Design a protein around this ligand. Sequence first.
Ligand SMILES: [Cl-]
Lengths: 306, 306
Amino acid sequence: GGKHVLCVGAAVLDTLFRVADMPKGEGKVLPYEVLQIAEGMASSAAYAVHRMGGRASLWGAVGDDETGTRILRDLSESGIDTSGMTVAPGARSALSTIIIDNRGERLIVPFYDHRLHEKKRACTPEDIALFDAVLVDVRWPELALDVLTVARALGKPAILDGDVAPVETLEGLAPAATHIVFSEPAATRLTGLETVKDMLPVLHARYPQTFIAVTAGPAGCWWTEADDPTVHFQTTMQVEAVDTLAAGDIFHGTFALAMAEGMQSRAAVRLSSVAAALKCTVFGGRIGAPTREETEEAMRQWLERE
Amino acid sequence: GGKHVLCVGAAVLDTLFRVADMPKGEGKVLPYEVLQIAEGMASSAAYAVHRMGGRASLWGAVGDDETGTRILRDLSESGIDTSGMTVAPGARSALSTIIIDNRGERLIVPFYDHRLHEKKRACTPEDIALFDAVLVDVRWPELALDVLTVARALGKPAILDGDVAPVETLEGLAPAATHIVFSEPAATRLTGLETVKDMLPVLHARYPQTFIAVTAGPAGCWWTEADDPTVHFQTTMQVEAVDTLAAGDIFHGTFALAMAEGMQSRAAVRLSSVAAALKCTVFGGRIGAPTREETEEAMRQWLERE
Ligand SMILES: [Cl-]
C-alpha cells in the first residue's frame, strides 16, 4: 500500500567519482570508488517516496538511446513506476560526471539536451486523480505547471521543489502550487535577501494562501502555513555530512509523501529533515535514502537528545 | 580485403566533455559538446587499421554490464571484429571522463577494474595464424606477452605499443616483440634519459634485433632498424592540434597495418605520422581517424611542401 505520489522532472545518469583531492586543472585524478546511478531532483524524490513507504511514479524524459535504457532500468529496479516516462525521439538523455573529494565537495559536469522537454506531454485530470499528491521540480516547467494546476484543482497537495532556476521559471510555477519548498539559493534569488529567516515574510506575503518552506541544510528549515504569516522553525539532526548530493530531494519526496498522508506540518518537516540527514551520511547521491523505519527510529532518538 | 591485424588491450567507454575553461576546483562547468566513444589504446589502433583499409580484430575484456554492451556495440559498429572479446564475469567495464578545454588540454578521471584481466584468455598458434600482424598495448600484459610470442614464432610482425606502464611491464613485453613503438614518456622512464634522440642508442643496444621507434608528437619520430644502430628521423606534418587524444593509437594501428602490408620503414613511419596528424585536427578522441585515401593525399601534398 502506501500513498501514491507523482514526481515530475529530472532523470539523469550520474557517474560519481570519489577522489581524495579535488583536481585543480589538467592532468589525471584516480578515483577510489565509482558509482553510476540514475537520479536527478524528481527521480531521487521518487526514490525517497518509495523508501519511505509510499508508491512513486515518475514523469520525466529520456532519449531513445543507451543512456535512456539505463536510466529507465535503474529507476524501475529502484522501486519507481516508470511506465509514464517520455522517450523523446531524437533527444539525448541527460548524464553528468560528479567528482566528489574527501571533503564531500563536488565538481559537476552536466550534459543536458533541451530537446528532452520540447514536446507536450499529456496531463489529464483522470491521469492525476490516481495520485494522492504530486511533486514537481524546475526541470520541465511546462509539464510541471500543468501537473500542479490539475492536482490543486482536484484537491490534492501540489508541491513545488523550488530549486535554482531562472527567476522567470520559479515565478511561473510558484502561483500553481499548494506547497513550495525552496532551497536557500533559490529563495535568495527570488527575494534578493541574504538570511533565510528574512525571506519567509516576503515569500509568505507574495503567496499568502500557500505553504512556504525554505530549507537551509544543517541550519534547519523555516516555514509559514497557508493564510498565516507566523514563521516557524525546525532544527535538523546533526550528522557527519559525507555526501549531501540529493539531500534536498530526499527531503522533498518525504515531505510530499507526508502531505499525501495528511501529516501535520512540523511532523512532516521533522521526518523529511531526519530522512535527509540520514542520506547525508552515505556516499552516493540518492543511494543513502533511508527506510521509513530507519527514519522513524532515528527521529525518536533525536527528539530525546540531550 | 586488406591485411588483417589483431589488436590486443584496452576497451574503455570514454565520455569527452568539451569545455571553454578547464575547471580548477569544486563547482560546475558546463560543456558545449559531449561525446561518448568506446576507445582505449588497442581499440583505437583497431579502428585506425579499419579506417586505413585493413581488417581489424580486437581481443580485450569488458564486464557483463551495461557499459560493456555499449563498448561492444560501438566497436563493432565502428568496423572492428569484436567476436573474440572477453566478457569477464563479475568485472566492471572500464570507463573514463575526459574534460577537454579550448586549449585541447585534458583532465582524465579513469575507472579501471583489474578483474577485467585476471583470467587467462586462450592464444593458440592456430588463432594467430589467421592474422597478418599483431599489435598489443600495455593494458593486458599476460595476454600481450602470449600474443607477441606466438605471432613472432609464426613469422608475423609482433608490434608492441610501448606506452606508459610500470617499467617491469615494459621490460617484460619488449623482449617478445619484433617491433616496438614507444611514446616519449615510456621511453623516458625506461632509459632514464631526457632527449628522445639520446634514447635510441640505448634502446637499440638493449634490443638490437628489434625495430625500435620513439614518437615525439609534433617533434617527429626517431627509429632504429633491426640489427643496425643507425638512428633515423622523420619529421611529421604540422597541423593545428585540436585534440591529440588517441593520436599515438592512430599511429600504431597505421604502422601495424603498414607492417602487415610489407611497407618500408620510412614509408610506414610517414603514413602513420600523417594519419596521426589528421586525427589531431578533429575533436573527439579516435573519431578523427582518417581514411587511407585522406592520408595518402595529405601525405602527397606534404611531401611536396615548400
Ligand atoms: Cl551507459
